[PDB]
Amino acid sequence: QESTMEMTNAQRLILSNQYKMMTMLDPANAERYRRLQTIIERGYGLQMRELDREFGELKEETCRTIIDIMEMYHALHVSWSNLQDQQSIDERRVTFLGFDAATEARYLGYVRFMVNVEGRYTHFDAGTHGFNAQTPMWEKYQRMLNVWHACPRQYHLSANEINQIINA
Amino acid sequence: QESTMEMTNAQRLILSNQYKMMTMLDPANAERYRRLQTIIERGYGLQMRELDREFGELKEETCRTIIDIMEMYHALHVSWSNLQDQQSIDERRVTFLGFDAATEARYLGYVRFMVNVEGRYTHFDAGTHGFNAQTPMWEKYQRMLNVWHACPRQYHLSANEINQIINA
Amino acid sequence: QESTMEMTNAQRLILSNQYKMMTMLDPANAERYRRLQTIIERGYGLQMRELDREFGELKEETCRTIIDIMEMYHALHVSWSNLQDQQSIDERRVTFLGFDAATEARYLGYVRFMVNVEGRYTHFDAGTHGFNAQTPMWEKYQRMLNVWHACPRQYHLSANEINQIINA
Amino acid sequence: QESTMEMTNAQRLILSNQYKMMTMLDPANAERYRRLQTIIERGYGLQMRELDREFGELKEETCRTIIDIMEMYHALHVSWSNLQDQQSIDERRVTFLGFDAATEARYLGYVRFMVNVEGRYTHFDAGTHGFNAQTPMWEKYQRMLNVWHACPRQYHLSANEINQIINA
Amino acid sequence: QESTMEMTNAQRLILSNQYKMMTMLDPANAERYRRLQTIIERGYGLQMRELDREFGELKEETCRTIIDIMEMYHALHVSWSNLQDQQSIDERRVTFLGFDAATEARYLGYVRFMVNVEGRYTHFDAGTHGFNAQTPMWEKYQRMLNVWHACPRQYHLSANEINQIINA
Amino acid sequence: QESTMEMTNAQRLILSNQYKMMTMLDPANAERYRRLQTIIERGYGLQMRELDREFGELKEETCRTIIDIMEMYHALHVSWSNLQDQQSIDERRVTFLGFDAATEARYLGYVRFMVNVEGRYTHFDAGTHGFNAQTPMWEKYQRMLNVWHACPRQYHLSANEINQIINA
Amino acid sequence: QESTMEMTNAQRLILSNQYKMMTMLDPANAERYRRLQTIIERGYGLQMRELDREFGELKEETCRTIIDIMEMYHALHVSWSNLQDQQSIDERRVTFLGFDAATEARYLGYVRFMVNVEGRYTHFDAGTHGFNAQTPMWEKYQRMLNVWHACPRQYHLSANEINQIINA
Amino acid sequence: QESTMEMTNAQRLILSNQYKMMTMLDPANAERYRRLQTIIERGYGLQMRELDREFGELKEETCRTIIDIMEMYHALHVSWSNLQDQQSIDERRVTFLGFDAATEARYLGYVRFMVNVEGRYTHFDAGTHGFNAQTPMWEKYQRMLNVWHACPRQYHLSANEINQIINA
Amino acid sequence: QESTMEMTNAQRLILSNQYKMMTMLDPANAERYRRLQTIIERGYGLQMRELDREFGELKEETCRTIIDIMEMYHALHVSWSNLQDQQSIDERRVTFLGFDAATEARYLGYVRFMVNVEGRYTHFDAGTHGFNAQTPMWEKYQRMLNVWHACPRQYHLSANEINQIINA
Amino acid sequence: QESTMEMTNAQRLILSNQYKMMTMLDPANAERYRRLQTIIERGYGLQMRELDREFGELKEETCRTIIDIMEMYHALHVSWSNLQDQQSIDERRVTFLGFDAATEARYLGYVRFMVNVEGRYTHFDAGTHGFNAQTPMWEKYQRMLNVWHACPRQYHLSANEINQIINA
Amino acid sequence: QESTMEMTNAQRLILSNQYKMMTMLDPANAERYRRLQTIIERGYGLQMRELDREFGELKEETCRTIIDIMEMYHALHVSWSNLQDQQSIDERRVTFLGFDAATEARYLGYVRFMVNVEGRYTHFDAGTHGFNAQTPMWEKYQRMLNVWHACPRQYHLSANEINQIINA
Amino acid sequence: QESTMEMTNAQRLILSNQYKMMTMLDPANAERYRRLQTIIERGYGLQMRELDREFGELKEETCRTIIDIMEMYHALHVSWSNLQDQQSIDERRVTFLGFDAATEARYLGYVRFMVNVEGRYTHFDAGTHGFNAQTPMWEKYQRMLNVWHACPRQYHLSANEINQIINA
Ligand SMILES: [Cl-]
Ligand SMILES: [Cl-]
Ligand SMILES: [Cl-]
Ligand SMILES: [Cl-]
Ligand SMILES: [Cl-]
Ligand SMILES: [Cl-]
Ligand SMILES: [Cl-]
Ligand SMILES: [Cl-]
Ligand SMILES: [Cl-]
Ligand SMILES: [Cl-]
Ligand SMILES: [Cl-]
Ligand SMILES: [Cl-]
Ligand SMILES: [Cl-]
Ligand SMILES: [Cl-]
Ligand SMILES: [Cl-]
Ligand SMILES: [Cl-]
Ligand SMILES: [Cl-]
Ligand SMILES: [Cl-]
Ligand SMILES: [Cl-]
Ligand SMILES: [Cl-]
Ligand SMILES: [Cl-]
Ligand SMILES: [Cl-]
Ligand SMILES: [Cl-]
Ligand SMILES: [Cl-]
Ligand SMILES: [Cl-]
Ligand SMILES: [Cl-]
Ligand SMILES: [Cl-]
Ligand SMILES: [Cl-]
Ligand SMILES: [Cl-]
Ligand SMILES: [Cl-]
């Protein structure tokens, strides 16, 4: 992530040409494109920095971690569903509840992208709030994962294994 | 701002392709785009320098200072009009006058951008010449800012404070 | 090749703009474009790496070696046909057979691009599988090329020369 | 400057998207665009090198020098046309003849650009081959420029000054 | 600190021998040990990363700060219990409440360690969730510590000093 | 990986001690332990290199790619079974076949570890040879993954999508 | 290996002289020698690279591994023949089969050099194809060597040991 | 290309011995060999530098470019020969005429080497001057190649394609 | 001595595994080992610093100097008791007295190690307090050594020499 | 080989724990383990250096050289045994006699390890002194090897070849 | 110095040409030459190492020292042969005895070279083993040289000077 | 000039092979070549230094200066003999005399090389001793050159100029 302010003159010309094309292709938004064209041509620094703030980052390992959490709960729920006596293990406890909108919006956004766009885990119960847990869940999932990955087998888990993971 | 003359061949190819697409989208200007396409393909250095001259720079801090000066006049004017007592302060002195066209062109442009494009400060009395002061003002404004920001309350100024500011 | 994850913010904006333009030009595929736009804007690292995987490399020297092998077989086949007569050399021996789909896919792909897109060597007998030899050939061809280029004349080969080449 | 083979994956993706867009806009040439898209996507080094050869360079100073030579002939010819005794100074010797098509192609290309595209020196006599002098002129013009710029005044030249220049 | 993936072959062999020994000593868990032995012997990068996540860090200064906060509450509460007019200073406000289980887990873990394992501050009231305050406290405690350490004497505090601290 | 030959003297002592302990714990195998103890103590370089050869590596990204390929086949097989109906797509096409024992042994080994030890993908039809495809697959799977990840939704695939993937 | 294109002028002269001497000694092949002399003297870069391709490398450790594999099979076969009796271990299992001509040509070539030129292992049953296994073996042999060198004694192996080795 | 003057003493001894051998092998030229022996032994610097001038260089890409030009004309001539109406396209225009002896002797020498020694393109008409064009042809061929390689197919070219290439 | 806090994750894992094995071997101390296991797994920095404080250092040269001082007293005592003449030298002065517990603790420890563990100097008269001098002695001993080693014969000293040594 | 004195605190703790375990596992040697534990904990430098002297080094090439010497004598003896007239070649001369205990103990130790532990060359006559030659043999074997490896075939050697090797 | 494995491709080609020439000149040994040609062409690392061992080094200073020792004995023996009372100084003690064949082979080799090839010190008595002293002499001779060169005159030595030298 | 002692083992091998070939070609000198072969194979440093001393150096500029001095005398002599007037200039003074054998040996050698081998200046009056001046002349010649080259015409000198030159 290098800043737009550091872009080269060639990159400025490339962008400028795109804004001119976008006005041709989408005249309803010419006001926006002409404004951006001015910012880029004149090199208005405040507005260029404000452009940086439109680009985010979610590291590859963080993405992978969020997916692994969902896989863990698939593992937990399958294992649970296939128990005989479910030892008072409440189903709500082997259900992925997601992440916090205030504090973990990047994570929650990623969950929604994996389900709604990529179409993964479409059988998971989102609740009535689309995986907003409304309390932070990151550090807790990290404890669960540490226990889960320490099981000598991660799928077809015993009730005890399930309890150790949900309890972490 | 790295010169267009230092662009990579991938960037030349990207620009070349844009000029072709621009021709497709806006055939009426085919001559203009074909000319630019030739300059970029042939790497005509003189014309590439001329392209560089189309791209300006207004540093982020300078944009912020222009905005601050306008905010300062908002404070001064709101303070002035709220003075129960008069002290016979002229309104022209508590009114933002703008920048010098001849030697402050980047600054006057930015004011006009902030007003007409971003929509900020639209209640300010523009010039007879749309914020073209005609005297150089940067140095002055700087003196006024230094005083304004030294007031422990920057808004709802007293007449003493108003006068300290405009006199700097 | 530098990874998409290292791209600059100007490059993210160029790309984002492209996906916006592609939606305007081809709303049928807006789902595809919007998804990519999101990956680029939010900087989703896992999906960005996946994008990396769409981009191959076949070094120039490797390209040239594949063409050289085809040229070698041209030389071999003309030489073998022009033989006052041919000393029980089977024509299959002096016929370019191609590359292994499984372990030599990039090489096979280039063969097909050179014949099918560039139009070179169109008179070569393609396989019953369009130059899929179904066994690795790269190492064999290198041994053949070494003998071929050691022949003081490389076209109009003697049957001794032809045999030394094919038995390499 | 950086060969196309050095382009980043971001630049490859940008180029690939342009070929997709150009196909949407200009389906008659879809073959050309798809071929390029393949080269860029697969990283076919030999074809990427060939792309490099489409891009030239003519240094800013060399551009200026070509223009200066034309201006010199303008100075010479105007000067000649106010001489009373034009001596036996032939007009052809104060006529810009151009550059060698075979060995000075980039220089001849730029003269043609300057006259035909930019519209400068349109009153110059182009002769019978559009400023192709058919013999190398660069070194000669350099000798002439050296004498011309050593004149304390460069316009309204004396006949002595003219002969000194053209004989250089 | 160095991930397990960076360990030397000597360290791998040491770890492999430990798993062999642990199997000799604890054959009931041979499955767990043999699985780890495989991961280490084969260098399975993904499982080695997962091992990394079993190891945490809590910087020496952060440990000391947690202890200091507890000591501060000790100072406050002792001080409060020798006040004549305890003002309407509620005892709960000079009671250490702990840390947030969800967002300050490492901090809550350390309090619990210090009390339950090291046996310090055993007379502290742990409340109804074993020092889980259920809301982030770190920043608050930092403000309190700042006032407390600015007292010329930190023990046998005045009511004014107490209120200054707790209101921080 | 750093070679056992580069180990420090502290590491040699740790290892030597281990072999001594293993003899105490498992005198049945004292011959093995004592031999290793001698190699380490005397620093016998040839045998130390041989020890190096016991330690493999399979990079984390490689691990993840193998799992991703299995997940791709899961997606393909569910999609193919959920088809309102299936357009003569043979199920063998959408069945994970594994890796080549001869040239892909590390990959095959990981597949087996993930199924047999971790318990993942236990419902996959293993071969008549437990995922030994008996022909190289790595390159094929990469081509499939590239198509799969370019599908805006990756689960619940259309038969067009399924075909594009399998024919890659 | 440094390329012939980087050779010094003294090295070009040494080489040129050699080709001159070879012509004097063997005028029958003067055409070959003179051609090489020209390539070296004129420094024809393409043909010089072709010369590079005549020179292989097989690292010393690789040489030694091939010999070690043959020695392993010697140990296996003697052990298997000396068995008081043999537990249905097929002799083909304990017979060195060689390397794959297609993908393992350097290895196969060294096997043949060691037997046919150095005279080592002349009692080994060569193939029906002189140690061309016609399938890749390098990875298999490495797995076998790892087991063999972990045997405290490597000659006079038990049938358990023999089986562990061959099944690796 | 490092100079003979920088050669090491070992290289001097090697050369000296070769000159002694060459006198034995070719006594008719002993005068030459004894002279060179003296130059090398005494390290006569002027004469050593004069040796440098016997070694040339023609870069690999330049070699490849010259061959590609010949291939282009093979492409042009085949395409031409297979037209129905050859649209007044003069055969002399799709015939490779070669290079200039004065200015491009290295290039012309390479053409002669490829045809006379390597035996390639033996069906090309050399003219009566063995591919001496007697005017510079390099920059022009570069234009032709740029057009040729921009054709979406390079062989079996239309008349228009042929005209665009020959016209460049 | 690199701090425990800087240990690698492989070293954390090694230590963790030791504490588990220690529990297996010495279950009575399970609480102590489990505590250390937690410190190491969680990376509790304060407790890890405390671990560092358990490890000391006595430089090799300092150990050698302690031993030399004891050897010096052996020489002095053997010399003294061999004096035919008396010269009334007290035996206490020719008897090694040890080191100061309070400020020379590392030194007194090493004497006690050398005597009680290594078994050296077991005939020396230990203290009433086992070589605890109670006055600091290092500096003194250093003065005595300097004199002793300046005697051309270090053993079978004269009374003059003995006195020179003890008086320093 | 880095010294024990440079070991890290983590390595000290690892060693300390091993000595505590070893006392549990081998109480008869607790005296030794407790002593080493003290040395490591207190960092007694003299004793730590004395630990270094327990670790040796025999480079991989030296190991390989010793084995090659034994192989050479296998080669010599087989060749000899298969001669018809053994030309007064004394069998003692084609028998490996080993190395010198005083001067070459590392080498002799390696021979004994290869035969007694690894079980190689078990048919060799050790003499009555287990391969102690009692005179240095290293430099001589180097001469033998140089000759042996210069034979164009190393096995099935003529009598002359045998004599040249034994004579070196 | 640079091992053969490091040689450049130019050096490989030079060596290959020599083997070809040596075969032309000495066809009786074609087998030897062709074998070496193969090793060099294929870059067989193990055989290239073996070539390295054919080349030794004896530093210039070590050569000079050997000669100096001989000269010293010349000085001693001449000096002895002009003594009147030769004391009971035995002549054998002023006779150069040589060097140890087993441990000082390079030194013994050089004496033999100097006497037998260069013809120096031919009047020296070589004894019964051609200057093989059968015991290491290097260190002794160094002590002698030290005394000899400390004589203010080194020739026409006194008997005292002689005994001082030989007793060194 | 890097010493022979620093040659690489490839260069030792090349030299060794030359001495073998030299023996084949010139068997009468076998003793001389075998001696050199031994020096090079054994790396006898003293004899290798002696080889270095066989190779000289005469810098290019020094060769050029010698030639210039001879050219200067050509100019002087041609000028002298063309003097219509005499001015009684002696011919000896306008005649090149050569260089000093004792202290200018490299210079006299080069003159003799230029005359007798290159054939330059063959009309010059050689000495009674073939250009051996017997007085050192370099410094003188330098003075004469400085004057000669300061004459604006270097040939067809006047008597004034001739005298200025010879007198320097
Ligand atoms: Cl589920
Ligand atoms: Cl674009
Ligand atoms: Cl306002
Ligand atoms: Cl207002
Ligand atoms: Cl005020
Ligand atoms: Cl044909
Ligand atoms: Cl870019
Ligand atoms: Cl230029
Ligand atoms: Cl004009
Ligand atoms: Cl005019
Ligand atoms: Cl360690
Ligand atoms: Cl922390
Ligand atoms: Cl308390
Ligand atoms: Cl209290
Ligand atoms: Cl399914
Ligand atoms: Cl057998
Ligand atoms: Cl043709
Ligand atoms: Cl351990
Ligand atoms: Cl004593
Ligand atoms: Cl005593
Ligand atoms: Cl004394
Ligand atoms: Cl044997
Ligand atoms: Cl060389
Ligand atoms: Cl030496
Ligand atoms: Cl003598
Ligand atoms: Cl004598
Ligand atoms: Cl040679
Ligand atoms: Cl003359
Ligand atoms: Cl003359
Ligand atoms: Cl004059």
XYZ file of C-alpha atoms in Angstrom, chain I residues 5-71:
67
model
C 12.394 -14.081 26.621
C 14.255 -14.252 23.286
C 13.873 -18.026 22.880
C 12.392 -19.360 19.675
C 9.040 -21.151 19.462
C 10.877 -24.439 18.835
C 12.703 -23.873 22.133
C 9.359 -23.027 23.868
C 7.987 -26.258 22.514
C 11.028 -28.220 23.647
C 10.707 -26.738 27.185
C 6.961 -27.363 27.231
C 7.502 -30.978 26.323
C 10.170 -31.311 29.052
C 7.713 -30.099 31.691
C 5.181 -32.688 30.532
C 7.783 -35.460 30.719
C 8.921 -34.210 34.100
C 5.335 -34.537 35.318
C 5.251 -38.126 34.019
C 8.555 -38.987 35.757
C 7.960 -36.985 38.995
C 4.181 -36.644 39.481
C 4.640 -35.421 43.057
C 5.978 -32.129 41.658
C 3.247 -31.766 38.959
C 2.235 -28.274 40.302
C 5.736 -26.886 39.936
C 6.146 -28.203 36.361
C 2.652 -27.128 35.275
C 3.372 -23.627 36.502
C 6.599 -23.464 34.447
C 4.819 -24.961 31.468
C 2.245 -22.111 31.660
C 4.909 -19.440 31.964
C 6.701 -20.765 28.888
C 3.544 -21.393 26.804
C 2.023 -18.013 27.580
C 5.377 -16.183 27.373
C 4.802 -14.389 30.711
C 7.711 -11.966 30.479
C 8.094 -11.131 34.122
C 8.295 -14.780 35.157
C 10.652 -15.431 32.229
C 13.036 -12.784 33.512
C 12.943 -14.498 36.874
C 14.065 -17.701 35.121
C 16.994 -15.807 33.635
C 18.056 -14.805 37.121
C 18.525 -18.546 37.970
C 21.470 -18.769 35.553
C 24.827 -17.368 36.528
C 28.191 -16.917 34.949
C 31.748 -17.396 36.268
C 34.195 -16.661 33.473
C 36.745 -19.239 32.581
C 39.612 -16.926 33.539
C 38.100 -16.234 36.928
C 37.709 -20.016 37.643
C 41.363 -20.451 36.616
C 42.510 -17.625 38.894
C 40.633 -19.168 41.869
C 42.356 -22.498 41.193
C 45.699 -20.760 40.781
C 45.340 -19.056 44.166
C 44.673 -22.406 45.792
C 47.694 -23.870 43.897
